Amino acid sequence: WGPFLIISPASTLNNWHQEFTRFVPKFKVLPYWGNPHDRKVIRRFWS
DNA sequence: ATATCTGACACGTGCCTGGAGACTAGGGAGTAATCCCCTTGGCGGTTAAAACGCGGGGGACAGCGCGTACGTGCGTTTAAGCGGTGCTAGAGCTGTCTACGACCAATTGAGCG
């Protein structure tokens, strides 16, 4: 139930969420990339 | 001589600028009906137009004198850097209310009697 963070090379910003659909699907996982208002706006959801 | 530096020189992704495709549906383009308009054009009370006889004053001097110019004195002017550090815009985010949408009433313009 803790907060955690992953940093990765950009071409791996896909398997890093797909793994959390099969190994254990229970996690609250948030991707973060895109145009400024694609990405930054997700910080207004978790606050 | 040597450590290691400053290009060489490239593909990493960010940002936004900037283009073209397929859709709705806003609105532009095509049109009569018909009115009512810009326009043509005679009418006579009123002022543009130019002399003669004339009044108001434009015009050219002489020189007095209340102000105007130079350009240096001298003490008062802003310059000037660079200490601290509050202001200031960025900017991240609400937390609504305020102006702008959706449904339908008082008051108006059109018809002719």
Curated annotation (Swiss-Prot):
Tissue expr: According to PubMed:10574462, widely expressed. According to PubMed:16298340, specifically expressed in brain, liver and pancreas.
Compartmental location: Cytoplasm; Nucleus; Cytoplasm, Cytoskeleton, Spindle; Chromosome
Source superkingdom: Eukaryota
Function: ATPase component of the chromatin remodeling INO80 complex which is involved in transcriptional regulation, DNA replication and DNA repair. Binds DNA. As part of the INO80 complex, remodels chromatin by shifting nucleosomes. Regulates transcription upon recruitment by YY1 to YY1-activated genes, where it acts as an essential coactivator. Involved in UV-damage excision DNA repair. The contribution to DNA double-strand break repair appears to be largely indirect through transcriptional regulation. Involved in DNA replication.
Any further remark recorded for this protein: Although the ATP-dependent helicase activity displayed by the INO80 complex requires INO80 ATPase activity, it is likely that the helicase function is carried out by the other components of the complex, RUVBL1 and RUVBL2, and not by INO80 itself.
Self-association and partners: Component of the chromatin remodeling INO80 complex; three different complex modules assemble on different domains of INO80. Interacts with DDB1. Interacts with transcriptional repressor protein YY1; the interaction recruits the INO80 complex to YY1 target genes. Interacts with YY1AP1. Interacts with tubulin alpha.
Domain-related comment: The DBINO region is involved in binding to DNA.
The name this protein goes by in its record: Chromatin-remodeling ATPase INO80
Biological source species: Homo sapiens (Human)
Gene: INO80
